[PDB]
Design a binder for this molecule. Structure first.
Ligand SMILES: *[C@@H]1O[C@H](CO[C@@H]2O[C@@H](C)[C@@H](O)[C@@H](O)[C@@H]2O)[C@@H](O[C@@H]2O[C@H](CO)[C@@H](O)[C@H](O)[C@H]2NC(C)=O)[C@H](O)[C@H]1NC(C)=O
Ligand SMILES: *[C@@H]1O[C@H](CO)[C@@H](O)[C@H](O)[C@H]1NC(C)=O
Lengths: 8, 274, 99
């Protein structure tokens, strides 16, 4: 499963 | 041996042509197994290896929702970076992320990682300790500070040590017949004339898995690694790999050169001549 | 950071006329990501073509595979044509059966 990315 | 779960993420803006193209490709070792491409009709997370048929519909629904959320985040990232770097709104830019984990034969974590690139250069990366980030420039330092104040490394650490490891274990269990197999390389040597009384001997290795392999040319029992040309190990379209390595030798001395092939599927390395 | 693609063309198995095989066009070490790749049979675009194995190296350059099933005939010529910002004109690399 993939990671939940937030933001830079 | 050890195994790995890796995701390659890319967001590429296209000023004047709509929203950025967003793509996610997942791998277990050298086998592509999942993919999301915002450019398709009704983009959804899709299986890329047969054993992924073992996941239920909920897997695909949840991963699709995550990918869409991820797509929005990177779209926002692209905009944000334009500001950090003081760039125009009309150029195309790229954000890339490599994320994943590796476990030993016993399924325990060996290491986790996540590295970002902006326009093909290092931007920010998680340190091996899984507790701090390293910024490549002053823009990335803005991100580092935001992430530190938001407890982002702690969140990521939980994913790498938990979710990543557990799912990798599950994928290796479900796809054991594919992921834990060994396909032995089959070799052959080609010969091509050249000007100045020389010939090119090319050693080929085909149909092998995993991708890791070693090809060397020897003369006098000593490897020639230096004056030999080669291509990087490459996928062959069916889950296997191939590679070639060549050396230029004097016409009439070909029999003095031998190609050696070392691979997990070769109990004894292959030795070949032309 | 604009890198020109390496274009490699090869079949899964040593070629045998009339025997199903797989033709590959691996495009690597390129940047930016935008690129157009097409496989051709006797100069005409092959419709089947699957794109797979997209990845990037440690220096971030892009890699991707175009592949299709094919049954070569003695007179058929196959090639791969690539269009990338790093080049003026599209580059075509031919399949060399005896390489
Ligand atoms: C791969 O593993 C299977 C065992 O099944 C696996 O575990 C399940 C829970 C699920 O994750 C499946 O998708 C997996 O395939 C092996 O098949 C078993 O082999 C035993 C003997 O060792 C046999 O008695 C059982 O009947 C088999 N089980 C089933 C469900 O058919 C299989 O041999 C392994 N393949 C390779 C190449 O190692
Ligand atoms: C951003 O670039 C513009 C020119 O395009 C320049 O006038 C301005 O000083 C720059 N801003 C900063 C903070 O460097």
């Amino acid at each position: 499963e993939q990671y939940k990315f937030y933001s830079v | 041996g050890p195994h790995s779960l890796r995701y390659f993420v890319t967001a590429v803006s296209r000023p004047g042509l709509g929203e950025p193209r967003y793509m996610e490709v997942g791998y277990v070792d050298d086998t592509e197994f999942v993919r999301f491409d915002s450019d398709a009709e009704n983009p959804r997370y899709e299986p890329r290896a047969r054993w992924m048929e073992q996941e239920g519909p909920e897997y695909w629904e949840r991963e699709t929702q995550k990918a869409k959320g991820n797509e929005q985040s990177f779209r926002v990232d692209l905009r944000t970076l334009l500001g950090y770097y003081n760039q125009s709104k009309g150029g195309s830019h790229t954000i890339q992320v490599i994320s994943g984990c590796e476990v030993g034969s016993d399924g325990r974590l060996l290491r986790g990682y996540q590295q970002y690139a902006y326009d093909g250069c290092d931007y920010i990366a998680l340190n091996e300790d899984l507790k701090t980030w390293t910024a490549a420039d002053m823009a990335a330092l803005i991100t580092k500070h935001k992430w530190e104040q938001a407890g982002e490394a702690e969140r990521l650490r939980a994913y790498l040590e938990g979710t990543c490891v557990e799912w990798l274990r599950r994928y290796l269990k479900n796809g054991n017949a594919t992921l834990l197999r060994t396909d032995s390389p089959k070799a052959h040597v080609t010969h091509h004339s050249r000007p100045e009384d020389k010939v090119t001997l090319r050693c080929w290795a085909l149909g092998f898995y995993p991708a890791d392999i070693t090809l060397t040319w020897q003369l006098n029992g000593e490897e020639l690694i230096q004056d030999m040309e080669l291509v990087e190990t490459r996928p062959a379209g069916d889950g296997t790999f191939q590679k070639w390595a060549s050396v230029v030798v004097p016409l009439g001395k070909e029999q003095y050169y031998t190609c050696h092939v070392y691979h997990q599927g070769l109990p004894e390395p292959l030795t070949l001549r032309w | 950071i604009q890198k020109t693609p390496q274009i490699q063309v090869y079949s899964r198995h040593p070629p045998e006329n009339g025997k199903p095989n797989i033709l590959n066009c691996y495009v690597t070490q390129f940047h930016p990501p935008h690129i157009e790749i097409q496989m051709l049979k006797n100069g005409k675009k092959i419709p089947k073509v699957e794109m797979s194995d997209m990845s990037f190296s440690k220096d971030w350059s892009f890699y991707i595979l175009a592949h299709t099933e094919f049954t070569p005939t003695e007179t058929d010529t196959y090639a791969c044509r690539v269009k990338h910002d790093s080049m003026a004109e599209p580059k075509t690399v031919y399949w060399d059966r005896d390489m």
